[PDB]
């Protein structure tokens, strides 16, 4: 068993000197898993050790391929480094050898593509269009504009991005074509793992971009107490007032969305208050995605 661990012994060499270049070079994209992975039992693994384990519903980073079993990646989390990524055929293949397993006992896909930086999008206190929410939200805005300044894109959408949905794609107000045509542009300004935010005024609500592969970070701006919506919307005019009964139902429906539906939930009686815990959220999500070695 000499001469053998010969040959394993360099092509392990090699594999590592490919790993450590991969620590530079950039994202070729990005994928949201819809299974769990662990390396914890196997070989055929490039560099013994450094394979990548994952739960369903995990991003990360594809920079490389190395051969058709394994990518070279990272998981999207503060600390992950560059290691071995299992590919789609190679996930397929174990899933076979399970069932033929499973059938012994005589008793899909695995990644979706999304962008490589998850699109940050904002919901609440009630419908866009209008003024309570599109003041508060021009608010965020602005305040992302200059905390992130040099590191972040506010892109406004107008086309429906709800409509994209995967399964409709890989086949109504606006067209098909021109929703492609924008989540194609919100796939490039990820690109290069810069922070985008979106301003999409058809979405009001977390589920309306589920089945959708831009895989959003919603952000729901949440005003804790109806009495306080109330009042606020009243500040503003007739010209509010009266579209009053639109707003607090929009606002009741978010109210009863379950929590998971949301990535942060900004409820502070201070906006100042609602800008620092956005920041502090992106500012660990940025670093999940960049940091160290890079
Ligand atoms: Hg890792």
Same mark, same amino acid.
């Given at each position: ?8 012994? !360099?092509?392990?060499? @090699?594999?590592?000197? @490919? ?15 819809? $299974? ?49 990524? %299992? ?9 076979? @050898? ?24 904002? $919901? ?24 992130? !300044?040099? &590191? ?20 109504? &107000? ?5 929703? @492609? ?24 609500? %977390? ?23 109330? &009042? ?27 929590? !998971? ?14 800008? !620092? ?18």
């Amino acid at each position: 068993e000499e001469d053998r661990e010969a040959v394993r012994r !360099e092509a392990e060499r @090699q594999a590592q000197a @490919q790993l450590e270049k991969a620590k530079t070079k950039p994202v070729a994209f990005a994928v949201r898993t819809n $299974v769990s992975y662990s390396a914890a039992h196997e070989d055929d693994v490039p560099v013994p050790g450094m394979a990548i384990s994952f739960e369903a519903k995990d991003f990360l980073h594809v920079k490389e391929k190395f051969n058709n079993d394994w990518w070279i990646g990272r998981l999207v989390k503060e600390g992950c480094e560059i290691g071995f990524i %299992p590919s789609r055929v190679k996930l397929e293949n174990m899933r076979l @050898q399970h069932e033929q397993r499973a059938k012994e006992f005589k008793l899909t896909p695995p990644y979706d593509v999304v962008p490589s930086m998850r699109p940050v999008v904002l $919901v609440g206190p009630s419908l866009k269009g209008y003024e309570v929410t599109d003041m508060m939200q021009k608010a965020l805005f602005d305040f992302l504009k200059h905390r992130f !300044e040099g &590191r972040i894109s506010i892109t406004r959408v107008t086309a429906d991005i709800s409509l994209a949905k995967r399964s409709v794609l890989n086949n109504t &107000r606006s067209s098909l074509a021109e929703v @492609q045509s924008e989540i194609e542009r919100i796939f490039e300004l990820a690109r290069t793992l810069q922070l985008v935010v979106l301003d999409a005024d058809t979405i009001n609500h %977390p589920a309306q971009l589920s089945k959708t592969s831009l895989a959003p970070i919603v952000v729901y701006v949440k005003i804790s107490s109806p009495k306080v919506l109330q &009042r606020l919307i009243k500040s503003r005019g007739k010209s509010q007032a009266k579209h009053l009964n639109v707003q607090m139902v929009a606002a009741d429906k978010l109210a009863q969305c379950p929590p !998971e539906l949301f990535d942060v939930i900004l409820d502070e009686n201070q906006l100042e208050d609602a800008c !620092e815990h956005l920041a502090d959220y992106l500012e660990a999500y940025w670093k999940a995605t960049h940091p160290p070695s890079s």
